[PDB]
Scaffold this active site. Structure first.
Site, mmCIF file in Angstrom:
data_model
loop_
_atom_site.group_PDB
_atom_site.id
_atom_site.type_symbol
_atom_site.label_atom_id
_atom_site.label_comp_id
_atom_site.label_asym_id
_atom_site.label_seq_id
_atom_site.Cartn_x
_atom_site.Cartn_y
_atom_site.Cartn_z
ATOM 1 N N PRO A 189 -1.923 -7.900 54.404
ATOM 2 C CA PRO A 189 -1.409 -7.239 55.638
ATOM 3 C C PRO A 189 -2.618 -6.841 56.464
ATOM 4 O O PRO A 189 -3.764 -6.911 55.967
ATOM 5 C CB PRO A 189 -0.696 -5.989 55.132
ATOM 6 C CG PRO A 189 -0.549 -6.151 53.615
ATOM 7 C CD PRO A 189 -1.266 -7.420 53.176
ATOM 8 N N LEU A 190 -2.381 -6.409 57.684
ATOM 9 C CA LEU A 190 -3.428 -5.964 58.568
ATOM 10 C C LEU A 190 -3.102 -4.474 58.861
ATOM 11 O O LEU A 190 -1.993 -4.164 59.283
ATOM 12 C CB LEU A 190 -3.260 -6.740 59.877
ATOM 13 C CG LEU A 190 -4.377 -6.947 60.903
ATOM 14 C CD1 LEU A 190 -4.094 -6.731 62.194
ATOM 15 C CD2 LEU A 190 -5.635 -6.291 60.738
ATOM 16 N N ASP A 232 -7.210 -8.535 49.648
ATOM 17 C CA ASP A 232 -6.355 -8.756 50.813
ATOM 18 C C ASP A 232 -6.599 -7.511 51.662
ATOM 19 O O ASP A 232 -5.783 -6.611 51.732
ATOM 20 C CB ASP A 232 -4.907 -8.891 50.393
ATOM 21 C CG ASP A 232 -3.974 -9.221 51.545
ATOM 22 O OD1 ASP A 232 -4.396 -9.503 52.709
ATOM 23 O OD2 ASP A 232 -2.743 -9.225 51.386
#
Lengths: 129, 130, 129
Positions: A1-2, A37
């Site tokens: 995810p960002l 991530d």
């Protein structure tokens, strides 16, 4: 995810790093993604540049307030509920940020909506799960 | 909703607050949310840092241009149409901003996608409606 | 579509403009939108203010790394796949940016979700396809 953080100026770079590490740990814990991530940005604002009320809920805001926007592939309702609690618990314990100082909005996209490098769509090619 | 404004440097902080107030009033009027449902950020940019054209529509752009991104739970097509007109009307009347200088993009999410404080999901717990 | 760039401080404004132009070209090529469908912002960050890893894919990140977030109406999977390739192709050719230094996340919205000017909803009125 960002994870995109909006905060007021005033933290040292060490305190920013603590906030990012604590939030990344909570995200990994809640969503079960790989530990690498990791995609995070920080935007610092002057006092004239954010207004964050409480919708009458009785929170609690100070200049340490953290607004977090998250862009992610779909997560279950429970994963989201867990992440909020894990996030405020880590930000309180590791950064001394009051839970009243944490606001989160999530937005969803899909497998085709990510390219991590080299012009590749790694969820589509199966390079990523 | 969350309202993120991208503008160019040049305004005083009073003129920023005026813009934010006018937009917030439009949003409350269009969408029917509580008046204290107010979450706004502003990012100021140098001339080299935003490019905003017009898709050949014939607008209008000056250094006063406002790009607004909104994240919101679902709204009807009518409510959105209403908001865009209320917003330019307010920005022109209250701030002197030309309607040619207002660009909006909206993104939707859902009840589970908000935590307003304390690690709580208030749309889920029923603390907010809902 | 709206293209939001997050980069580290370091480039001249000519280098920024060349990045924006290259990316805009790629998006016009991949999505078939009018050449004047151009809506772009840039946020510059100090070393403390973005963390971008690789999810273990083996990329390659330098201080020149570009994180691009796109808001767009729906696009086919192939169009998005093409866009990512055209994007790194142009950023390498025109800006000297390594494809390992390009990360893209897309978020979708619909016709009712845009107002380009004058309080109008141009995708709804038919002013725009």
């Amino acid at each position: 995810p960002l994870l995109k953080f909006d905060l007021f100026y005033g933290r040292t770079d060490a305190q920013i790093k603590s906030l990012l590490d604590a939030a990344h740990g909570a995200m990994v814990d809640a969503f079960g993604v790989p530990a690498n991530d990791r995609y995070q940005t920080v935007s610092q604002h002057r006092p004239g540049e954010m207004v964050l009320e409480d919708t009458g809920l009785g929170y609690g805001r100070s200049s340490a307030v953290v607004l977090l926007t998250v862009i992610s592939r779909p997560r279950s309702e429970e994963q989201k509920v867990c992440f909020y609690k894990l996030l405020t618990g880590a930000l309180e314990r590791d950064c001394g940020i009051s839970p009243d100082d944490v606001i989160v909005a999530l937005v969803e996209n899909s497998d085709a909506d990510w390219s991590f490098g080299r012009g590749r769509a790694e969820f589509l090619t199966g390079d990523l799960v």
